[PDB]
């Protein structure tokens, strides 16, 4: 859609892979502020707002805290304490058409600065002078929407760029979107460090003759000590024994 009508998507309760996006190197700009770019794969977020739109090249730098400009002030306002990431990639070879691509429009002027994450449903004509336009143009009356001259022969600074802003919001609600988890081949009959579903420890894993219920994950004996756990990806119930130790 248009940049002033940026497409907003709500994302929750899924695994979000950012390693492929980071290592693709097909995005001109990949800037994450308020979070550690390496730690998105290792952190979970309550909700994700994906704001997708298309702008020109020189306006990419305006998508940052403390920036001033047409897009930041009148189209899409980001807070100074914004917590999220911006991914911008050139689409010249995909958005090039004979005669230019003028489908996308951007808001040029507004009565006041937009509030953060504010969607505009009113298209009031900008009032430059003392006589209100009231939907009638003329002197001191300029339309707030302006086209993009996405000519194939134009410079890179004016070339179209597709920009997706992923805003990670956390509230008094459980985290839903989570990063990818790395699974490593298990080893048996060895005093090894284990990490099952965030439960960490050390021990020796062996086959178990016990019978879990279909929904049960791990079992603990008396004194609140985990003695069995079901390895996923095989659903194998395994007994666990503390590493052999003693006095000398």
């Amino acid at each position: 859609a248009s940049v002033y009508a940026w497409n907003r998507k709500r994302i929750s309760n899924c695994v979000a892979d950012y390693s492929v996006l980071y290592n693709s190197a097909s995005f001109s700009t990949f800037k994450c502020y308020g979070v550690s770019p390496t730690k998105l794969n290792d952190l979970c977020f309550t909700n994700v707002y994906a704001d997708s739109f298309v702008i020109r090249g020189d306006e990419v730098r305006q998508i940052a805290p403390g920036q001033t400009g047409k897009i930041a002030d009148y189209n899409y306002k980001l807070p100074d304490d914004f917590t999220g990431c911006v991914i911008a990639w050139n689409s010249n070879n995909l958005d090039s058409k004979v005669g230019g691509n003028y489908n996308y429009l951007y808001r040029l002027f507004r009565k006041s600065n937009l509030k953060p994450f504010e969607r505009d449903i009113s298209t009031e004509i900008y009032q430059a002078g003392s006589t209100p336009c009231n939907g009638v143009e003329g002197f001191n009356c300029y339309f707030p929407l302006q086209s993009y001259g996405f000519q194939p022969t134009n410079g890179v600074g004016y070339q179209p760029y597709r920009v997706v802003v992923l805003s990670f919001e956390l509230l008094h609600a459980p985290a839903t979107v989570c990063g990818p988890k790395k699974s490593t081949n298990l080893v048996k009959n060895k005093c090894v460090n284990f990490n099952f579903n965030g439960l960490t420890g050390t021990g020796v894993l062996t086959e178990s003759n016990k019978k879990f219920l279909p929904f049960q994950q791990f079992g603990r004996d008396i004194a609140d000590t985990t003695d069995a756990v079901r390895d996923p990806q095989t659903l194998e119930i395994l007994d666990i024994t503390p590493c052999s130790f003693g006095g000398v």
Partner: nanobody
Amino acid sequence: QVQLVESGGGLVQAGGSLRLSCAASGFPVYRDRMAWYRQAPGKEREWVAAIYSAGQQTRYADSVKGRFTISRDNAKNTVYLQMNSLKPEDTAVYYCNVKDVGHHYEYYDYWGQGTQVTVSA
């Protein structure tokens, strides 16, 4: 390059019908704003008509509402301007206008040559 042409107009009797055609090549007419102005001899410039690709479909002057229509065709890339119930105030020069934005926040307006319309009572 980009060139625009206005066809139609001339000398016509009162009460007739007129159909102007604005044809622009080098850029599609489906854009932010397409403007049409009237200029009278010895009078100031004033906005008349506009068509937009978002929000309100069309905008007309307050003195021509109800008897004046405009449409566009992107396949053949031409804007038709149909008008009926001619009035003596319509004897003027019609201008077809576009606006564009530069790389350095500079706005350039491409103005049309326009066509003269004369109404005889």
